[PDB]
Structure 1
């Protein structure tokens, strides 16, 4: 097992979350905590003015090839129709590495959930799609529903879960593995 600065920093931020410390005082760009069931995805999520800055900067805004999980600069509220989060596929089996776990058919059929923790609240997103290979602004239900049947079909396996225009969708993308969860 390889221990380095990036693994030390992230495991310490995880500790500060267990202790209920306010992370945003460490980084004003902090948004919420993200964790996925039966993975080591248990990281902080930040937002910049773009989808590129936190590709090499850690949570402390220092250089880091592991980066920090960040959310699309275009997302605005937890009531957004498709919330997108980007994270690298680091080879320490860290960051968004465990998304490849959703290539296992048994794992997909098992219900592992996407968990967003925001201001002492817990939102649960049920995974319904996983596939190898991004709209946040939907001008009406038609586009949004077209987007739903669009990604429900790309899934490598068919999820028993049925999503429709009255659910909200979270999306975890690498920077490629992609999975989708619904609420």
Structure 2
């Protein structure tokens, strides 16, 4: 079990989140907290002006190979139809490494929910698609529904949870494993 500077920073931020501290006063790019059931994915999510800055920057904007979970720069609100979050597949089983656990068919059949915590509110997304390999803007309902059929049939396993254009989707993509949840 490796203990390095990155696992210490992330473990300290999980404690501050548990102590209900305002993480925005540490990093103004902070948007919400993210966790996935039955995984060690329990990290803050930030957002920059692009989709590359936090690839090699930790929550304190220092150089880090683990980086920070960051949401796509194109997304604007929690009411967007597809919220995309990017994270690394670290060899020490951190960040988005536990997305690989959704390759297991028995684990996938278990309803592991994606949890977004924002302003004292919990948003639960039931995972319905997981596969190995991303649109944030949809012009109309047809483009969104086509996107739903696209990622549903891409799933390695049929999910008992079905999704239509009346749902909101969250996407956890590695920067490659990719999973999709629905609200």
TM-score, with length taken from structure 1: 1.00
Report SS of the residue matched to 2:54.
helix
Please list the CA deviations of residues 91-137 of structure 1 after superposition, one character each: whole Å capped at 9, or x if unmatched: 11000000000000000000000000000000000000000011000
Structure 1: which 5+ residue stretches go unaligned?
Answer: none
Structure 2: which 5+ residue stretches go unaligned?
Answer: none
Instruction: Find the aligned partners of 1:175 and 1:18 in 2 and give their Cα distance.
Output: 27
Computed over aligned residues only, the root mean square deviation of the Cα atoms, in angstroms, reads 0.2
What is aligned with 2:86?
Answer: 86
Report SS of the residue matched to 2:96.
helix
Runs of 4+ in structure 1 over 3 Å off: none
Q: What is the CA-CA distance between 1:51 and the residue it aligns to?
A: 0.1
Instruction: Find the aligned partners of 2:36 and 2:168 in 1 and give their Cα distance.
Output: 17
Report SS of the residue matched to 1:95.
coil
Q: What is the CA-CA distance between 1:71 and the residue it aligns to?
A: 0.2
Q: What is the CA-CA distance between 1:57 and the residue it aligns to?
A: 0.3
Q: What is the CA-CA distance between 1:69 and the residue it aligns to?
A: 0.1
Q: What is the CA-CA distance between 1:47 and the residue it aligns to?
A: 0.1
Report SS of the residue matched to 2:179.
strand
Instruction: Find the aligned partners of 2:139 and 2:91 in 1 and give their Cα distance.
Output: 38
TM-score, with length taken from structure 2: 1.00
Give 1:1-183 correspondences, 5 Å limit.
1-183=1-183
Instruction: Find the aligned partners of 2:60 and 2:132 in 1 and give their Cα distance.
Output: 31
Report SS of the residue matched to 2:159.
coil
Q: What is the CA-CA distance between 1:31 and the residue it aligns to?
A: 0.2
Please list the CA deviations of residues 4-27 of structure 1 after superposition, one character each: whole Å capped at 9, or x if unmatched: 000000000000000000000000
Instruction: Find the aligned partners of 1:79 and 1:176 in 2 and give their Cα distance.
Output: 26
Q: What is the CA-CA distance between 1:83 and the residue it aligns to?
A: 0.1
Q: What is the CA-CA distance between 1:73 and the residue it aligns to?
A: 0.1
Report SS of the residue matched to 2:50.
coil
Please list the CA deviations of residues 25-63 of structure 1 after superposition, one character each: whole Å capped at 9, or x if unmatched: 000000000000000000000000000000000000000
